[PDB]
RNA sequence: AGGAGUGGAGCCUGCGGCUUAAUUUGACCAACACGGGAAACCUCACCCGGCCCGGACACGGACAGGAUUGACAGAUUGAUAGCUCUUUCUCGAUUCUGUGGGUGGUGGUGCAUGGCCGUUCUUAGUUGGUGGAGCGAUUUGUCUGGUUAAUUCCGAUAACGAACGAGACUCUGGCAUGCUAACUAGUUACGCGACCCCCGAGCGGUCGGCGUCCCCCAACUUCUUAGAGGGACAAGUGGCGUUCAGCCACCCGAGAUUGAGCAAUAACAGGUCUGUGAUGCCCUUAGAUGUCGGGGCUGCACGCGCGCUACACUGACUGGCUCAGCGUGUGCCUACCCUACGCCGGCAGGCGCGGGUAACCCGUUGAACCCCAUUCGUGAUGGGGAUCGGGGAUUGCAAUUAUUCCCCAUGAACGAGGAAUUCCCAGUAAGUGCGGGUCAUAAGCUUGCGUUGAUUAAGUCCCUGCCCUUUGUACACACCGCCCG
RNA sequence: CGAGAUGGU
């Protein structure tokens, strides 16, 4: 770069890069249980951290797939030789991640399991994992040539105002069967977690809580106490 | 596109009597006819151009779709028995009826 | 217009008075400071509304019983 | 109650009908300046012609005196397409050929589907668990009354305890001489320094006036930027309220309704396959429904929709003076950006030479209406500027069916608009100009910003509709229903 | 107490 690009173009181009990388990884690592990518920079080096539920499938027999993925990321995005490193990392609390639950429901349907038996199968596992509530939806040609939908729901679920940006986790997916495409949508509502990264640290806007009064003595008589 | 009736009932699929309306001629067992009178009950009186008048009936596929009228031009299927009676197969627009007469397909009797 | 107070305000004010009656008084600006240290309230605008109805209830309790 | 209108005129632009080789097509409150749809080519799907394989792979055949590839010249052709015909060089196992099978498609079905969006519907609405009532569909909770913008509160009570919507929440506007602290932001002051004026107590001065004239190794944060905190609660006083929940006026105060975003359950045969490597089934597949050349999308007796300019004197024309805010900027394949200053030309425009990847350069963004002086004189007039002749620049591979721009000339209808009908309550309506999108060339559209700034209301259910309850029914395809001679 | 019929998608 013989003269540097302006800050408006620089900040937009850095966002366009993260979007294409997330699409490539989404469709390479679908059955291997992918759920997100994180990227960080240091002098002469870029480190990419990748989250999945079955990390040994991301590596392969002696690390083959990490070496193949390092090669194609470098080849496509134009990094110089050896400046790119890929690290696989294991997903914590996989029942509270909406993308891993949308993909496992997609592969469970694609194997020929019945729709209600599959949908109550994930609805139980999300609520046993410690969510405050959830909503699962499937739609398309469910049983016959005319389209239908099903809602499955449990616990609490908010729809309006700013808290939706940090208390609700969501995913949408497609599955192709011999008669055409079905849609899947998954929503999960997170628990409040003061510190520990199960959920958000910020409380709900209308949850006031009062501290309890303690240990007073009702009677008194006048006395003095020297040190 | 343009409606030409007026009602609540947008509940159907649109008629699209357009584009590849490929021109249809007779096979064996068929005739061209002009409507003379319309009766009740989905039946009509029609004259074909070789001069045998018949009582005629709307096929179940054309009900409440292809509205027939007096002096209109139609394609009719004959019966191998009961020669006084027949059934409607098609209606020709005034744009198609002139093309039939331009191909010499109709005697100089039909009105357009 | 409309100045009616919702159940989130009216319930929090009653629970404060049941526990801390001996701290409270008629001055809004002192009640507003007490309610900030005895409770976790997410918004400054909600804290002002709670201390307002607490100040209204103290002036009622000085005359006779309040059923709740 | 009123304001500005629209419907009448000329022109722009979307739709139907007609015309045509083709004038590609979706859509009929909730279609019609809408598909971000401003088509010269491309886009491009339509119409007239011509090259090409970009037909994987499998099996069989043909084949190293050879499977196959490419081409000069003449004829041919819109054509410098070796397309094809005559001729005779060239390449080297990569192809060719028959059968099977694939592959592509702005082809068909939105009435086969996913995703997204619109609408019912801007209002206050919706639902389990355990208990009570009915053989049952169902019901109560979810209410007689008062109160609120609100299924918002009070209270009542065969129900008790909860969930979503509402509200809270997020962004934004108006206040801080208090905090943090600035050569990519300023002020004040002086060591002072410089130009101009004597108008000034008084000189041509220490001292006065004027400055985007210039240094500070002066002091500072009022004006600009932007981080943290503060502030408003129906909190205070007087009335009215089953004296509760609330409602009205007033003091003090920057301020006692700022404006947007997000939004439930259940639906619609609503729109979209022409946004997609989202997609089932059907069609087509070498004389192709997968690339180049030319034409069309603009065609004009006629009906309709959203708009621009006007009918003048509360004006038009010619000079002079003086004030904004929001933004964008060297294109990463893809090859283009925003402009000061000097010179040539009436103008559009041309040449030279610098700054800017931006609180740094265009830039103190010298904006329009408005303001001050002049000319015209109630005349289709010096109002209005449609229609049309001749000449000159700029973009581009190409401007004719006129791309856009400049100049002289020509000088239509129109004198405040029939029956009808739209939007609007305060920095609002209306007037007035400037940025962004689309862009090689270019707004009469749309999405934002500032500037000048009113009249009329503080209400009602009459007209068109929405919410809740009681009531009647021969309706459930649900009054655009059903039905008799 | 004016006049207020009818219904392809």
Curated annotation (Swiss-Prot), chain A:
The modification N-acetylalanine is found at residue 2. Its EC number is 4.2.99.18. One of its GO terms (biological process) is positive regulation of apoptotic signaling pathway. CDD domains: KH-II_40S_S3. It catalyses: 2'-deoxyribonucleotide-(2'-deoxyribose 5'-phosphate)-2'-deoxyribonucleotide-DNA = a 3'-end 2'-deoxyribonucleotide-(2,3-dehydro-2,3-deoxyribose 5'-phosphate)-DNA + a 5'-end 5'-phospho-2'-deoxyribonucleoside-DNA + H(+). It is found in: Cytoplasm; Nucleus; Nucleus, Nucleolus; Mitochondrion inner membrane. Residues 21-92 form the KH type-2 domain. There is a cross-link at residue 214 (Glycyl lysine isopeptide (Lys-Gly) (interchain with G-Cter in SUMO2)). The modification Phosphoserine is found at residues 6, 35, 104, 209, 224. The modification N6-succinyllysine is found at residue 132. It comes from the Eukaryota. The modification Phosphothreonine is found at residues 42, 70, 220-221. Residues 200-227 are annotated as: Disordered. The modification Asymmetric dimethylarginine is found at residues 64-65, 67. There is a cross-link at residues 90, 202, 214 (Glycyl lysine isopeptide (Lys-Gly) (interchain with G-Cter in ubiquitin)). Endonuclease activity is inhibited by MgCl2 on apurinic/apyrimidinic DNA but not on UV-irradiated DNA. One of its GO terms (cellular component) is cytosolic ribosome. Methylation by PRMT1 is required for import into the nucleolus and for ribosome assembly. Component of the 40S small ribosomal subunit. Identified in a IGF2BP1-dependent mRNP granule complex containing untranslated mRNAs. Interacts with HNRPD. Interacts with PRMT1; the interaction methylates RPS3. Interacts with SUMO1; the interaction sumoylates RPS3. Interacts with UBC9. Interacts with CDK1; the interaction phosphorylates RPS3. Interacts with PRKCD; the interaction phosphorylates RPS3. Interacts with PKB/AKT; the interaction phosphorylates RPS3. Component of the small ribosomal subunit. The ribosome is a large ribonucleoprotein complex responsible for the synthesis of proteins in the cell. Has endonuclease activity and plays a role in repair of damaged DNA. Cleaves phosphodiester bonds of DNAs containing altered bases with broad specificity and cleaves supercoiled DNA more efficiently than relaxed DNA. Displays high binding affinity for 7,8-dihydro-8-oxoguanine (8-oxoG), a common DNA lesion caused by reactive oxygen species (ROS). Has also been shown to bind with similar affinity to intact and damaged DNA. This is Small ribosomal subunit protein uS3. The lineage of its organism: Eukaryota, Metazoa, Chordata, Craniata, Vertebrata. The gene is RPS3.
From Swiss-Prot, chain C:
One of its GO terms (molecular function) is structural constituent of ribosome. The keyword Cell division does not apply. It comes from the Eukaryota. One of its GO terms (biological process) is translation. The modification N6-succinyllysine is found at residue 19. It is found in: Cytoplasm; Nucleus, Nucleolus. One of its GO terms (cellular component) is cytosolic ribosome. Keywords: Cytoplasm, Isopeptide bond, Nucleus, Phosphoprotein, Ribonucleoprotein, Ribosomal protein, Ubl conjugation. Component of the small ribosomal subunit. The ribosome is a large ribonucleoprotein complex responsible for the synthesis of proteins in the cell. Part of the small subunit (SSU) processome, first precursor of the small eukaryotic ribosomal subunit. During the assembly of the SSU processome in the nucleolus, many ribosome biogenesis factors, an RNA chaperone and ribosomal proteins associate with the nascent pre-rRNA and work in concert to generate RNA folding, modifications, rearrangements and cleavage as well as targeted degradation of pre-ribosomal RNA by the RNA exosome. Component of the small ribosomal subunit. Part of the small subunit (SSU) processome, composed of more than 70 proteins and the RNA chaperone small nucleolar RNA (snoRNA) U3. Belongs to the eukaryotic ribosomal protein eS17 family. This is Small ribosomal subunit protein eS17. The chain holds residues 1 to 68 of 135 of the full protein.
């Amino acid at each position: 770069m013989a003269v540097q690009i302006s800050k408006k173009r620089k900040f937009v181009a850095d966002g366009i890069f993260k979007a294409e990388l997330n699409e490539f990884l989404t469709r390479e690592l679908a059955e291997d249980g992918y759920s997100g990518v994180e990227v960080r920079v240091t002098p002469t080096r870029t480190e990419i951290i990748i989250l999945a539920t079955r990390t040994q499938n991301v590596l392969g027999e002696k690390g083959r797939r990490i070496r193949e993925l390092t090669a194609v990321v470098q080849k496509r995005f134009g990094f110089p030789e050896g400046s790119v490193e890929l690290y696989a990392e294991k997903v914590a609390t996989r029942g509270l991640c909406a993308i891993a639950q949308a993909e496992s429901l997609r592969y469970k349907l694609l194997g020929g399991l019945a729709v209600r038996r599959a949908c109550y199968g994930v609805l139980r596992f999300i609520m046993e994992s410690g969510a405050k509530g959830c909503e699962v939806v499937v739609s398309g040609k469910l049983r016959g040539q005319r389209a239908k939908s099903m809602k499955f729901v449990d616990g609490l679920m908010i729809h309006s105002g700013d808290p939706v940006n940090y208390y609700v986790d969501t995913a949408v997916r497609h599955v192709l069967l011999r008669q055409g495409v079905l849609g899947i949508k998954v929503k999960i509502m997170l628990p409040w977690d003061p510190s520990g990264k199960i959920g958000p640290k910020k409380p709900l806007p209308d949850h006031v809580s009062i501290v309890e009064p303690k240990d007073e003595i009702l009677p008194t008589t006048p006395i003095s106490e020297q040190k | 596109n343009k409606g030409k009736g007026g009602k609540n009932r947008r509940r159907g699929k649109n008629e699209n009597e357009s584009e590849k309306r490929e021109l249809v001629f007779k096979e064996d067992g068929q005739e061209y006819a002009q409507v003379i009178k319309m009766l009740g009950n989905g039946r009509l009186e029609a004259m074909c151009f070789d001069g045998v008048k018949r009582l005629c009936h709307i096929r179940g596929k054309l009900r409440k779709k292809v509205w027939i009228n007096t002096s209109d031009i139609i394609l009719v299927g004959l019966r191998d028995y009961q020669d006084n009676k027949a059934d409607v197969i098609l209606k020709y627009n005034a744009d198609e009826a002139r093309s039939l007469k331009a191909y010499g397909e109709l005697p100089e009797h039909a009105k357009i | 217009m409309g100045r009616v107070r919702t159940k989130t305000v009216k319930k929090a004010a009653r629970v404060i008075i049941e526990k801390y009656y001996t701290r409270l008084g008629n001055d809004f600006h002192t009640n507003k400071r007490v309610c900030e240290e005895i409770a976790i309230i997410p918004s400054k605008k909600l804290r002002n509304k709670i201390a307002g109805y607490v100040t209204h209830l103290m002036k009622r309790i000085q005359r006779g019983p309040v059923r709740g």
